[PDB]
From a paper:
The tail has a length of 560 Å and terminates into a baseplate with three radiating TFs of ~190 Å in length.
The TBP inserts into the MCP hexamer with a short stalk formed by a six-stranded β-barrel. In icosahedral and asymmetric reconstructions of the capsid, the turret heads were poorly resolved, an indication of flexibility. To improve the resolution of the turret map, localized reconstruction techniques were used (flowchart S1). (E) Diagonal view of MCP5, showing that each MCP6 carries a turret, while all MCP5 remain unoccupied.
Residue numbers in the entry:
A (entry chain TB), B (entry chain TC), C (entry chain TA): 2 to 413
Write the structure that this text describes.
């Protein structure tokens, strides 16, 4: 035992102690048996924010022309440097453009930008924001991301997915770059700090299945036919609730298959806005430990997927104590697509194929074509076996590496 | 000190506590002094299992020709997808061939495959399994790995070491690939999911010395002449037992040398089958903490070398709580060799040079020539100083990077 | 709660416990809430020491000729192998030369060497040591590092920054390697194990600001104008001391900016030699936990910058329990400079630009030109805003990636 430790207050020398909960200011442990971390040491929020090189700076707007809408310096609400740029428009799209002092070669370069939504209203309270490159021939190439409420309420980087290209665009001879939106009754959004990242590696695909439906069994068989790895974005309360969701044994048996892995999606799927940050934190913590009891270990259980795609900087700050990376939701090919090097592991989206495989298969083919990473997702109740087989065969026939979320985060 | 925590049961507010053992469900620690992990958060077993791309699928056997032996679909027992290939043969080898719809280029690629042993019997209950590529000239190039009892009793991936090449083989212009065994009185094995991985980097060499014999001093001096890293696969009980084993001070002094590092080999060298999984787990745990007391810290002490080379999925499952990677034993060049990218950190072997340096020097030259990683090993009682000098000069003269196990795992 | 644990001595079954300090031999924790590590599991001291390939081993001095000074095989005192080279000179420099058996190509290679100071005296206690390549035209190219008291008192690898080049030096056709010093009344230094590492990737810049002076606000704006990331080498006691040092809220606000990160510099700036190792360890530990309370999380708070640049192997040994990487100080361009691949994360220096920007802007231009990493530093009280703008524009105009210390360590 020894004698009692040094000091005042209740001090005790024990042999063996059992407790439900231990709070300690400091703990000196000679040998630690604690593989099941809830609270992770890594804060991922700002690690990736300053990768690559700043291509466009916004610190002086003399080089930018407002083509449509309006542009002004914002020196109070600054992402980086001395100022950011306010983009503002009424009943109109905004389009601003910058002309290079010499021809730019952007072969193997992906694009990223800082964004904050102040106001957007019209056909949606959101807009696609599009980085358009333009060549010496006036062909465009478009990369895009979504400015939304919640996830855009505070400054956050988007890593832009390929969207479209005018046939024969000369990426070696880019003469201007342009930033533009859909038209709305009101637009007020801030931007800053455009970054260029090396994306010269192969294209890559990530597949996630949400919400632990019984069809995940047939999904695992289908995507298994080409060794494509599936992430089960798992809610542990949903297991054994009904015939429509996996049993505990089915989930464990699925995760034993070498291509299936689990990521956290909250114990009871508590989404942002629908619940308080505290209740979501409990859902996150409980999701983590329940999945760890089901054998989901560290590199896997460091990933989270936003319940119902809802998020904000509030939820990101909370989640950063427990997870390193998270994914939202979108309907279109550019939502799935990111450069291979991220600059935010929190803000990026996934393309749904619950509504039809077109946008996902467009993303997979574009991932191959333009050397990008595509994240595609579904619920296995919504999607038929034939739809899964279309996507699986698209991925097998494309020039992409199918990868886990763990692999993708390890590449950063 | 404060007042007692919220709750029923025995609750206590302490200042300073000492314990031999603490069991907690929840531990909230504001500052952690616990560098010596026993139980690691990372589960390496299935992380690497979906690296690279599935080259050959076994999901439809219409494309496979049974040259010798016999081939059938297994659908009750499947690594990946809807099916796996059963290979069955009597008083013969099995050899199955797939002819490509167009010429294949495998320059800088390495190969991997999923395997399970159902039965093998004859002169040995084990076989080399060989992936043979064949060119437009009918030159072969062969890579291989071993199907063994224990390590093949459940599905596991092998990552295939180069073995042989017919002079002038055109790796750019492969027309067919072949899976084949040695001849045996009975063969019954399942295969699935052949994977191609990028191995276009330089060749690499890893040297391990097992069981802490006193000759490790001369070994350290010899391999030190060319700064080649030595892994001591260490049993901490063996230190100070006899004049034939290192003293504690000698072992610490060896590890202070910049090229020497320690990996776990069980406190008392308990091996699979010879002892229960529980006893081996205790030996693994004690090995880890005794070596940590001797100063062997995290990236080093995350590696384990199987005692007497014995293992199975039972032991891998247990070891995955404590270690990230383990290595078995073999006698030939294709044992030492792997692609630079593994798909299993658990199933791969090492070539002995206890009996003679030939197959190890072959492995080093193959690693240089064909861009692969070679792991070579010995006991320093079995090997004379001039034999070590032959191997050390072989490594120094070859085009390979000599690396640590830590470096190799960080590259995955 | 359950019944009391197995054992003699004081045993207890608790529900909820609170403690200031817990000492445990074994802790079995089912769910760990301990993001704030003080003791890190990783021991970085010898991980990188045996990267790359040994070029000159000094294990046979038949190939070496003294141009000036004297040389012997040191067999009593050896970094690597059977021997080291003892370099000794009186009232003179030393310069020793090895002729290559053929034209070496060192395009994209960087250089590293083991060093120990026995004695250096005269005009200084210390010397630049230069690795000095000679081409087929008798042009030199020079890389260098500093031999000093303290940091050189025990064997430690230096990774050599570019220093100078005779115009038109053919790096593809190198004919002789030379090792040389400044002239001194006494020189007695041991060298061993010259290593070659691949540094063919892009050049890189790391910017650190020391000692939390209020000018860090203007620095954040200036380097922010180009998205270059700043490391605050932070002392947590200094916050709120004076108008001349940041407030706690200013420091937190600074670290919320995506390009500003914090690294430890000791709670109260206790430097080696000035205080005992125990006092410095307390300063290191308190620095770590106070900065963790300010929100500085794991990958950031795993870096430490030496207070007043003072260090030895004693401090490195102690620091290795808490940090992975540390940086000293120097006045000149080669002090900033390293290959992209280190071999010691502990012995490398930073170039001051407190005394004018010239040597740092030389280092930035050389980082671009020769594909190297440059670490530059200042105190924001010493440096005017125009000097910061000169450095910031130098970095933005150069061909370098500006990076965090975290990014740099993740690349190793
Ligand atoms: Mg700005
Ligand atoms: Mg299969
Ligand atoms: Mg030596
Ligand atoms: Zn969901
Ligand atoms: Zn052994
Ligand atoms: Zn300082």
């Amino acid at each position: 035992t020894g004698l009692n430790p040094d000091g005042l207050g209740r001090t005790a020398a024990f042999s063996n102690t059992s407790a439900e909960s231990v709070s300690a200011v400091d703990a000196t442990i000679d040998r630690l048996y604690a593989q099941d971390r809830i609270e992770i040491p890594t804060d991922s929020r700002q690690l990736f924010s300053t990768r690559g090189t700043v291509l466009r700076n916004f610190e002086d707007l003399s080089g930018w022309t407002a083509n449509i809408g309006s542009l002004s310096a914002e020196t109070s609400d600054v992402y980086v440097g001395s100022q950011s740029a306010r983009l503002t428009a009424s009943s109109s799209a905004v389009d601003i453009r910058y002309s290079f002092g010499t021809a730019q070669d952007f072969t193997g370069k992906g694009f990223s930008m800082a964004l904050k939504r102040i106001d957007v209203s019209g056909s949606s309270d959101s807009t696609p924001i599009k980085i358009r490159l333009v060549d010496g021939n006036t062909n465009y190439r478009t990369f895009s991301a979504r400015c939304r409420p919640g996830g855009g309420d505070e400054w956050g980087r988007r890593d832009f997915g390929f969207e479209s290209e005018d046939t024969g665009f000369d990426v070696t001879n880019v003469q201007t770059m342009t930033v533009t939106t859909n038209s709305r009754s009101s637009i007020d959004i801030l931007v800053d700090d455009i970054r260029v990242v090396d994306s010269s590696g192969t294209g890559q695909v990530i597949v996630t299945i949400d919400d632990v439906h019984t069809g995940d069994k047939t999904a695992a068989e289908v995507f298994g036919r080409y060794g494509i790895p599936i992430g089960l974005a798992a809610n542990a309360k949903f297991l054994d609730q009904s015939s429509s969701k996996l049993t505990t044994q089915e989930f464990k048996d699925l995760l034993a298959k070498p291509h299936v892995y689990a990521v956290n999606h909250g114990y009871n799927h508590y989404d942002y806005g629908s619940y308080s940050i505290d209740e979501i934190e409990d859902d996150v913590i409980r999701g983590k430990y329940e999945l760890q009891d089901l054998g989901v270990r560290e590199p896997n259980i460091n990933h989270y997927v936003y319940p119902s795609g809802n998020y904000a900087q509030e939820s990101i700050d909370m989640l950063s104590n427990y997870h390193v990376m998270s994914w939202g939701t979108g309907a279109e090919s550019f939502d799935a697509l990111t450069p291979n090097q991220l600059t935010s592991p929190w803000h990026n989206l996934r393309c749904s194929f619950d509504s039809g495989t077109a946008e996902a298969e467009q993303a997979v083919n574009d991932a191959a074509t333009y050397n990008q990473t595509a994240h595609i997702y579904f619920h296995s109740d919504n999607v038929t076996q034939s739809e899964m087989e279309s996507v699986a065969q698209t991925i097998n026939s494309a020039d992409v590496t199918p990868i886990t979320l763990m692999d993708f985060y390890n590449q950063q």
